[PDB]
Write a protein that binds this ligand. Structure first.
Ligand SMILES: Cc1ncc(COP(=O)(O)O)c(CNNC(=O)CNC(=O)c2ccccc2[N+](=O)[O-])c1O
Ligand SMILES: Cc1ncc(COP(=O)(O)O)c(CNNC(=O)CNC(=O)c2ccccc2[N+](=O)[O-])c1O
Ligand SMILES: Cc1ncc(COP(=O)(O)O)c(CNNC(=O)CNC(=O)c2ccccc2[N+](=O)[O-])c1O
Ligand SMILES: Cc1ncc(COP(=O)(O)O)c(CNNC(=O)CNC(=O)c2ccccc2[N+](=O)[O-])c1O
Lengths: 391, 391, 392, 392
């Protein structure tokens, strides 16, 4: 039923108004026909009645309903991009004197938000290994307000044991807010809220949009946390434009047919790479032997198309250039989750610098691939030609 | 030359590409043709070279150039709405232990951001009377990091003596960042940076857009402050979508013909109201006798169309309804700065609650009007019929 | 009740705005019927503003249509992908093989070319008339004249028709003719075509109504007589415009008064200054005495827009033309006009003689067409003035 | 080189993307010339992908056009505001008074109506042929036959043409005929019309190419023979589409393979289950044996999309029709199809007989047309199954 849910999510008649898709209602001012009307809207301004564009229009409410049904939440808070949803969801719950506990595999800007913004506001952050599981109790302080997960991890793709972490956190700091950047799973391949996580955050920019042309962050919250996140994010003026909400809603419609192709293609490339003479290791959550694969197999209902592998060699600059500058199909760029395939390289030194309190365990150049919707054999061909350029 | 500047602002060929208007480049991923290319973009990622959608596309850079030329700045930082530009421009400059000094006439959500978000981050806020001028030294602490102005003030429309406040602030706390919400002036009727203000902030939502259908905040910064605001806002993931940037750029083109009509019409209504038997006072910066009018006349090059007046009576609920529910032309709604005319009422109690460390000096119902582009005599007719409903 | 109030409010009923200030943007091809009964009711009202199929329009189209009928005083508005589409398709909707089309020889070139290249091969003939022919138009009417096509002011050369005299003459000989006008210069509002007994007022909404040179759309506002046939026959050619464009056009109306007053004030000031300039032979601005049909402009129009032309005393050679046109700081070379920015275009008399069928030109120097936008008028005059310095 | 790779990359050259993954959206009517020389060069290349005027298109149009020529193997793509506009205007671009149009009687109703209501009054006649006539089409050719109009599978009833036999027969008698096809069902890609010797492949891009039921656009991909005349004559009717829509259509291509594979797999599964259902008399799915022209589908197509129909054993009365159609949970009633969602439409044999000129229908029960979208196929079968329960 996921495919059916996706097609229908948020498409109530009060939002579509005769069309198939939600209307696009562009507004700041929302007009009250009367003082009574204005009073009614005012009491329901956080409850899907038209009140002010900053709180949203029909189009925003449609997307919010859809995200709440897809991720099993009480509310969905919207932001101009994923990095805004992370920074602002964390800010919404902290105060001076708090502690933040974040996976050391967190997306780099999520780490930087912590080390550069929070630290000057009297909030401390420390970090843990993604495979720590129930041993995360070691790192929990009496002032731990936030435990921030990302499964699979950015770049190196380690999958957490979420149930073990959650049980540990609840037993030691029940007041903590547990958050996850669940972008890799597009929110639907790993039902974070069903595991006792409080807030599931996405760079909706990625798979939800699906086309590399609109930026939006979402935070689906359980009932415990929705009001605080919603009201504090509002005080920060966080919102997303109506047209971007429309396009994200529209992305959901093909999310299933897309994710199934990204899964099938990326796993095939990964299986091929793992057997390649020029390849040291492959980090793909779906691949047997990858870090946390057991958790992926147990806790997820699918895979997306982002993963990485480690070359046997550490490429020098000339080799790096010969490798990356000559691809026919893979493009160099940041972000992922679109229809096209992307490639990026990270040297182990670069990764060592964004693994706080951790230790890197590879020495070759790491290549991150996003496998899009091109023919998978064309993409294999392209990688095979790349391996020839560096033998 | 303002009219000419507005027509041409940010319309360089590298942005328009053969068209009259800037292109609309929707993107998250921006592609690097080579490793060298990627290195060059990386060093120039805050300097108008394509790097990542979060930093912006051609369309964002075009708007940023235009805002910088119109307000005489080193840089323009973009946000999803005005409330986001205020909250995030202030956050960008504070740390735990700082003090914020804000006019007590500041837009309510700007005050709330302070009292509800900053206070829990160990930052204190206090407030001053808008007409305080050089006497603001009274309120300056050795830890005052931000002095936040809004001229004219929200709702009651008091105009600051900006030169006197700035001189006082500089002489006592030279390290302070002086900020203004300059939305009423659309940034161009009061050249805030030329007065020694560090950051000029707009709800671009208002006059810059001009049509009540796109939300966007801007912060034009001098060279002293641009980097910090830009980089810290980025760490908060602040941005605006490409299409909204396009539409804001497009708004500028008619900004002059619009503002001239809002000035001419609103002043005529104000002159009429000031002579009306049912009216106690009129708060219009352009009107002789209004609070700070002398400063407006000296420091501004024009007026917009937002102002307020005070009824001789304090309307009861039945009267409020009879008055507001029966207008033909004025609509009830929040925001302003569009092509249409709006009306809102505030009771003195409501205003008393958002004037921290101040004292209200009126007792009748306050009516805030936004005078749009309708025929001014039609709008007078509509108000005259409204006065008949409450005699 | 004044035009500015009309412009702000046109089309903005709550059934289209749904709480917002502007109409909603309803993007759709499929429109869903909740029941057989609902489907049957929508079928009955499919050309009557009930959601039935995207090709017939959505709420966003209905809003614009309502606003256009209000502004031009029409019974209906038919929408098209651009001005040229509204012209070609409004003519096509009323003709049959064996009909005759009578068109002003000052008509926009593609409108003439549609007649001469498309209609001719469908057994429909066209002839042309001088825009100042007035009551003597009777001389050009045939038994089979189906359409009389006006454009006032004319394209490029700006001649104003004596519309009352023309309309009275046509009605006296072929009362059942379809009289159409390309009313783009006036933006449908500075000249109220339907009050003058014209059947169809056509605009490239691309120009003034949109106002920003970034969307294309044609409109045809019809009296009650002609609406059904134009609408149904335009529908059979699949003519429509996208919902977003309809939104932007409605949004354009909002500032149309403040923009046109500026275009009027500025262009008139530039035209007066050009009239006094030694390098200028003649100025073709409808608002200016000595301009063809000025007298009809004064009587029949309530304003001027920003488009006009003037004739140089010299006929520039290619080198002087480049010198002149290549070195402007504020005027740009471009087609279209009706936007916020100022534009310049040169035409040699030989070029204009070639698109004046069955008529003669009245000038021999280089003709410059100006669009005066919203820039400072003195900056614009300084730019023009430096141009003259380049060709003395 | 496979279709999926093609789809992801079609039209995405750097001169159109400018650093982004997708083409830029260039909204424009005016396109600015920096000099007389630049203006002269743009004039020369105005139908050749150089920015000249918005009506000819911007970078966003050129990108789509390139992608369409690549996908359908054409020399050019002409763009139109909707499918119906691409049909009416592609036919109009090639005819003259005294020509004859020969069209399949299974052609989309508005395509027939254009012929019978518009072309007839311009001295152009039309006749119709059974979609299975194959090589016997020679029998319907006239000395003056200018156009032969195919649609395969046919609208509603889904009959597949034996295109090779038809094309060979037409070429043997009137080699200079213009053969056109409405190729919307195949999305231009499951049947490569131009490899079959057809001159013009027309789509309502509104359907599969856009894929989401929220933009309207027509395309006509032309061989080298026919491109200029279709393009220039379509230009004279002011035919274009807005830049944003062109963007969205190009963006639609990106997911067209993953969507069509799903539509194929799901619709085939539903069609097989319907074939076995007791309340079902016949299933018209091209992919299914016993369906008219299935044999030509198997030989000539590389896939199926999600649109098909089936015929009930009963002819439903009005009460049963309401009962059936009014109570679906996942299927919606709507026109158009080719989107992500599932749709249902009923037609009575009397309705279809009325739009089958010069031919007979082959069924007598109620005909149901299904669009199978991206929902779970078993959920869809449960919805259909509950429907049958409502009319047993
Ligand atoms: C898991 C996850 N979570 C949030 C975001 C941010 O979303 P947004 O890009 O929509 O703000 C992302 C964005 N990801 N982009 C990429 O992984 C590739 N880009 C980067 O790594 C990048 C780009 C620009 C600047 C800096 C970095 N970086 O890693 O430091 C994410 O991967
Ligand atoms: C001077 C100034 N500065 C910033 C903003 C906010 O910009 P944004 O609306 O684009 O976020 C505004 C927005 N103004 N809106 C209005 O004055 C009318 N609305 C309100 O007062 C309002 C609306 C909704 C909720 C609360 C309030 N309020 O005053 O508390 C502003 O006036
Ligand atoms: C009075 C009038 N009426 C209709 C139209 C057409 O509008 P559209 O551009 O929205 O189709 C216009 C168009 N105005 N455009 C120009 O002056 C510039 N462009 C051209 O003239 C042009 C452009 C493309 C192809 C052919 C020509 N031409 O003049 O032959 C008009 O001036
Ligand atoms: C094979 C084929 N070819 C062209 C078009 C037209 O596309 P457009 O809707 O983009 O013009 C279509 C249109 N498909 N639309 C439908 O099945 C639903 N709508 C209608 O049939 C309809 C709609 C409006 C007016 C008239 C009709 N009609 O069938 O007569 C098509 O099926």
């Amino acid at each position: 039923k996921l495919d059916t849910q996706l097609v229908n999510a948020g498409r109530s008649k009060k939002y579509t108004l005769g069309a198939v898709n939600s209307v696009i209602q562009r507004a700041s001012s929302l007009v009250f026909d009367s003082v009574e009307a204005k009073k009614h809207a005012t009491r329901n301004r956080a409850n899907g009645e038209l009140f002010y564009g900053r709180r949203g229009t029909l189009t925003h409410f449609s997307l919010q309903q859809a995200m709440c049904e897809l991720e099993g939440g009480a509310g969905c808070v919207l932001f101009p991009c994923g990095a805004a949803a992370v920074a602002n969801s964390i800010l919404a719950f902290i105060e001076q004197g708090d502690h933040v506990l974040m996976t050391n595999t967190a997306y780099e800007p999520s780490q930087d938000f912590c080390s550069k913004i929070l630290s000057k506001l009297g909030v401390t952050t420390s970090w843990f290994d993604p495979l720590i599981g129930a041993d995360i109790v070691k790192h929990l302080q009496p002032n731990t307000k936030i435990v921030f997960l990302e499964s699979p991890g950015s770049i190196t793709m380690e999958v957490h044991d979420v149930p073990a972490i959650v049980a540990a956190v609840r037993s030691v700091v029940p007041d903590a807010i547990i958050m996850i950047d669940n972008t890799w799973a597009a929110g639907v391949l790993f039902k974070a809220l069903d595991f006792g996580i409080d807030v599931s955050i996405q760079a909706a920019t990625k798979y939800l949009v699906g086309h590399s042309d609109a930026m939006i962050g979402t935070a689906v919250c359980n009932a415990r946390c929705w009001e605080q996140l919603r009201e504090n994010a509002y005080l920060m003026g966080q919102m997303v434009d109506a047209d971007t909400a429309y396009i994200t809603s529209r992305g959901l419609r093909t999310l299933g047919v897309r994710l199934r192709q990204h899964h099938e293609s990326s796993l095939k490339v990964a299986e091929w790479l793992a057997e390649h003479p020029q390849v040291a290791r492959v980090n793909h959550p779906a691949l047997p032997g990858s870090k946390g694969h057991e958790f992926w197999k147990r806790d997820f209902t699918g895979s997306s198309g982002l993963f990485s592998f480690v070359l046997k060699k550490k490429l020098n600059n000339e080799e790096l250039a010969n490798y990356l500058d000559n691809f026919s199909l893979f493009s160099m760029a940041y972000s992922w989750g679109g229809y096209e395939s992307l490639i990026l390289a990270n040297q182990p030194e670069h990764i060592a610098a964004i693994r706080p309190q951790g230790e890197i365990d590879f020495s070759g150049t790491l290549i991150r691939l996003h496998i899009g919707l091109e023919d998978v054999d064309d993409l294999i061909a392209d990688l095979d030609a790349g391996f020839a350029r560096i033998v």
